[PDB]
Structure formats: structure tokens, C-alpha cells
Design an enzyme around this catalytic site. Sequence first.
Site, PDB file in Angstrom:
ATOM      1  N   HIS A  41     -22.104 -37.726  -0.477  1.00 40.87           N
ATOM      2  CA  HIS A  41     -22.422 -36.706   0.514  1.00 40.87           C
ATOM      3  C   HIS A  41     -21.908 -37.171   1.879  1.00 40.87           C
ATOM      4  O   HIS A  41     -22.135 -36.537   2.814  1.00 40.87           O
ATOM      5  CB  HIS A  41     -23.903 -36.375   0.538  1.00 40.87           C
ATOM      6  CG  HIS A  41     -24.921 -37.106   1.300  1.00 40.87           C
ATOM      7  ND1 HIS A  41     -25.663 -38.054   0.790  1.00 40.87           N
ATOM      8  CD2 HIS A  41     -25.201 -37.141   2.466  1.00 40.87           C
ATOM      9  CE1 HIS A  41     -26.567 -38.708   1.715  1.00 40.87           C
ATOM     10  NE2 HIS A  41     -26.168 -38.100   2.854  1.00 40.87           N
ATOM     11  N   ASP A  83     -25.090 -39.358  -6.311  1.00 45.50           N
ATOM     12  CA  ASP A  83     -24.781 -39.608  -4.972  1.00 45.50           C
ATOM     13  C   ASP A  83     -23.938 -40.766  -4.556  1.00 45.50           C
ATOM     14  O   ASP A  83     -24.689 -41.618  -3.829  1.00 45.50           O
ATOM     15  CB  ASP A  83     -26.008 -39.069  -3.984  1.00 45.50           C
ATOM     16  CG  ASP A  83     -25.516 -39.070  -2.557  1.00 45.50           C
ATOM     17  OD1 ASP A  83     -24.168 -38.848  -2.437  1.00 45.50           O
ATOM     18  OD2 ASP A  83     -26.374 -38.827  -1.667  1.00 45.50           O
ATOM     19  N   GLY A 174     -28.221 -40.730   9.164  1.00 44.76           N
ATOM     20  CA  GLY A 174     -27.135 -41.746   9.395  1.00 44.76           C
ATOM     21  C   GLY A 174     -27.141 -42.935   8.647  1.00 44.76           C
ATOM     22  O   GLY A 174     -26.171 -43.728   8.742  1.00 44.76           O
ATOM     23  N   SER A 176     -27.351 -42.969   5.282  1.00 48.12           N
ATOM     24  CA  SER A 176     -26.713 -42.672   3.801  1.00 48.12           C
ATOM     25  C   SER A 176     -25.865 -43.829   3.481  1.00 48.12           C
ATOM     26  O   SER A 176     -24.763 -44.086   4.255  1.00 48.12           O
ATOM     27  CB  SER A 176     -26.287 -41.656   3.756  1.00 48.12           C
ATOM     28  OG  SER A 176     -27.309 -40.385   3.847  1.00 48.12           O
ATOM     29  N   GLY A 177     -25.661 -44.325   2.240  1.00 45.54           N
ATOM     30  CA  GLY A 177     -24.666 -44.964   1.905  1.00 45.54           C
ATOM     31  C   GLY A 177     -25.059 -46.422   1.936  1.00 45.54           C
ATOM     32  O   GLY A 177     -24.392 -47.285   1.549  1.00 45.54           O
TER      33      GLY A 177
HETATM   34  C1  LIG Z   1     -26.610 -38.552   4.134  1.00 48.54           C
HETATM   35  C2  LIG Z   1     -27.696 -39.405   4.681  1.00 48.54           C
HETATM   36  O1  LIG Z   1     -27.430 -40.043   6.181  1.00 48.54           O
HETATM   37  C3  LIG Z   1     -28.950 -38.898   4.745  1.00 48.54           C
HETATM   38  C4  LIG Z   1     -30.135 -39.941   4.952  1.00 48.54           C
HETATM   39  C5  LIG Z   1     -31.700 -39.363   4.987  1.00 48.54           C
HETATM   40  C6  LIG Z   1     -32.565 -40.184   4.229  1.00 48.54           C
HETATM   41  C7  LIG Z   1     -33.939 -39.641   4.126  1.00 48.54           C
HETATM   42  C8  LIG Z   1     -34.310 -38.440   4.909  1.00 48.54           C
HETATM   43  C9  LIG Z   1     -33.138 -37.861   5.874  1.00 48.54           C
HETATM   44  C10 LIG Z   1     -31.947 -38.199   5.591  1.00 48.54           C
HETATM   45  N1  LIG Z   1     -29.477 -37.948   3.752  1.00 48.54           N
HETATM   46  C11 LIG Z   1     -28.991 -36.545   3.756  1.00 48.54           C
HETATM   47  O2  LIG Z   1     -28.794 -36.101   4.729  1.00 48.54           O
HETATM   48  C12 LIG Z   1     -29.559 -36.036   2.314  1.00 48.54           C
HETATM   49  C13 LIG Z   1     -28.248 -35.162   1.932  1.00 48.54           C
HETATM   50  C14 LIG Z   1     -28.211 -33.871   2.329  1.00 48.54           C
HETATM   51  C15 LIG Z   1     -29.931 -33.387   2.330  1.00 48.54           C
HETATM   52  N2  LIG Z   1     -30.388 -34.813   2.573  1.00 48.54           N
HETATM   53  C16 LIG Z   1     -31.662 -34.772   3.027  1.00 48.54           C
HETATM   54  O3  LIG Z   1     -32.270 -35.871   3.066  1.00 48.54           O
HETATM   55  C17 LIG Z   1     -32.477 -33.512   3.150  1.00 48.54           C
HETATM   56  C18 LIG Z   1     -33.180 -33.401   4.413  1.00 48.54           C
HETATM   57  N3  LIG Z   1     -33.739 -33.473   2.061  1.00 48.54           N
HETATM   58  C19 LIG Z   1     -33.807 -32.478   1.274  1.00 48.54           C
HETATM   59  O4  LIG Z   1     -33.409 -31.535   1.389  1.00 48.54           O
HETATM   60  C20 LIG Z   1     -34.875 -32.646   0.393  1.00 48.54           C
HETATM   61  C21 LIG Z   1     -34.279 -32.516  -1.318  1.00 48.54           C
HETATM   62  N4  LIG Z   1     -36.137 -31.453   0.248  1.00 48.54           N
HETATM   63  C22 LIG Z   1     -36.781 -31.564   1.260  1.00 48.54           C
HETATM   64  O5  LIG Z   1     -36.605 -32.046   2.384  1.00 48.54           O
HETATM   65  C23 LIG Z   1     -37.809 -30.420   1.199  1.00 48.54           C
HETATM   66  C24 LIG Z   1     -37.132 -28.961   1.435  1.00 48.54           C
HETATM   67  C25 LIG Z   1     -37.554 -27.761   0.357  1.00 48.54           C
HETATM   68  O6  LIG Z   1     -38.835 -28.228  -0.126  1.00 48.54           O
HETATM   69  O7  LIG Z   1     -36.840 -27.035   0.102  1.00 48.54           O
END
Ligand SMILES: *C[C@@](*)(O)[C@H](Cc1ccccc1)NC(=O)[C@@H]1CCCN1C(=O)[C@H](C)NC(=O)[C@H](C)NC(=O)CCC(=O)O
Length: 224
Positions: A41, A83, A174, A176-177
Site C-alpha cells: 500500500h 501487503d 508513515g 509502513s513497509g
Molecule cells: C501505510 C502505513 O504507513 C500505515 C501504518 C499504520 C500502522 C498502524 C496504524 C495506523 C497506520 N498503514 C495504513 O495506513 C493502513 C493501510 C491503509 C489503511 N491502514 C490503516 O492502518 C487503517 C487506519 N486501518 C484500518 O482501516 C483498520 C483495518 N480498521 C480500523 O481502523 C477500524 C475501522 C472500522 O472498523 O471500519
Amino acid sequence: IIDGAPCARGSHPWQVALLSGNQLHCGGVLVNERWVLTAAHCKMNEYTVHLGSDTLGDRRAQRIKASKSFRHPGYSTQTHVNDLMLVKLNSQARLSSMVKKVRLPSRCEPPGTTCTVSGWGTTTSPDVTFPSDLMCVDVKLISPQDCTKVYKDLLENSMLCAGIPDSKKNACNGDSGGPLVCRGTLQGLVSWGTFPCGQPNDPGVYTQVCKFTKWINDTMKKHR
Ligand SMILES: *C[C@@](*)(O)[C@H](Cc1ccccc1)NC(=O)[C@@H]1CCCN1C(=O)[C@H](C)NC(=O)[C@H](C)NC(=O)CCC(=O)O
Ligand SMILES: [Cu+2]
Ligand SMILES: [Cu+2]
């Protein structure tokens, strides 16, 4: 990284950062002189890869261009299963005392193992704060059974959870990866979590690398 501390200088030579010019986008790990492993992602149309320093913007740091990215064929933009993605470096990566290959795992570390996750992601949430220095935090791998109790249907195959009970210690936007390392070997790549980040008992979710070793090798073997 939430509730962490600056990583000890030079303790993460295989850590890299994916930048959109000058701004941090994601983290990642250097597999070899030409391959960076990161989250699927984290895909971009073109990357500016930072290597060689714990400080983003370091004048001594290496900044290599990347235009080729190869996501796992099973990546889902809807469930985020699988991912992971490899990004081909346009130019060679000059190794040194501050830039080295990461040690891929030969097996899956068990639940309860203490590991280190690192990144330049936000250290606060919901409000965002980006550090110039690489942050580190220790977490423990959580069994798939235990994690399923928290995330239920959100958890797909090869999704490894890690965190500390009743603790804000986690990854965030930020990060991620980025690498999740246990016993000198790469066990995970930061994938996702809940928002705001650092909610106690809400585990961080990582792509379980020990499940993609064959894919990682074959993909690097086929594209140069
Ligand atoms: C891409 C990376 O930088 C980032 C890192 C991260 C790790 C932990 C927490 C937050 C962020 N990851 C993401 O942005 C990933 C990929 C896009 C979606 N994402 C998320 O972490 C999002 C915030 N999480 C969700 O959508 C999860 C699956 N569910 C919920 O937060 C509950 C909402 C619901 O019940 O619909
Ligand atoms: Cu970005
Ligand atoms: Cu999503």
C-alpha cells in the site's frame, strides 16, 4: 512510532525510507544492492529512496531514484492481505558501514517473542508529528488466535500482530513497509493498525515475512 525512542545510531543500516521528493511516505528494508522490500500500500509512481542515515535530510545520506515496483500478485486494496512489495532501485546501492543488506528469515518466530519495530512515522495521533530521527520501540508477537479476538474478520492470512498489553507502544502513519525485527532477522513489515494509533490492546498488524520468502526470491530472480 508511538511511545518509542530514537534508535541507537547505526543500529539500522538496512532501514530505508520512501520519499515523495523530500517528504516521508513509508519505510522499508534494503534486501540487496537493487531491491527494497516495503508495503504494497506504499506504492508510488516514482520513489526517492533514503539510505545510509538515521536522520531524514542528512547531507551524507544516499538518495536513489526508483520507478519500478512489484506488488505481490495477491495484494488486496480492500482487505490489504498480502501487503508487501519490492521496489527496484534505478541505480546501484553503495554499501558501507551505514548501509547493509537485511537478514531475511528462514522461519517464523513464535508468539511472545520480543521484537523491534522502527520508522520515521508519526510519533503522535490523531495529530501528526514527524521526527527527523529514526524511532524504535519494542513489542511482542501476539498469536493469531489472540489477535483474532481483537480484529476478527479484519485479519487475513499472513497477518502477524505485535504489541505490548495495555501499552501505546505501536507503529503509525508513515511507518509502513518498515522492519519488525526479532533475533537479528526480519519477521515483519509494518502494514496496518487502528486509528488513532497507539490504542492500548490494539495490536499493530504486520506482513509476516516468513510466509513470502519464496515469492521474494523468485521475484528478484526474474526481474534482473
Ligand atoms: C501505510 C502505513 O504507513 C500505515 C501504518 C499504520 C500502522 C498502524 C496504524 C495506523 C497506520 N498503514 C495504513 O495506513 C493502513 C493501510 C491503509 C489503511 N491502514 C490503516 O492502518 C487503517 C487506519 N486501518 C484500518 O482501516 C483498520 C483495518 N480498521 C480500523 O481502523 C477500524 C475501522 C472500522 O472498523 O471500519
Ligand atoms: Cu505520503
Ligand atoms: Cu483499507
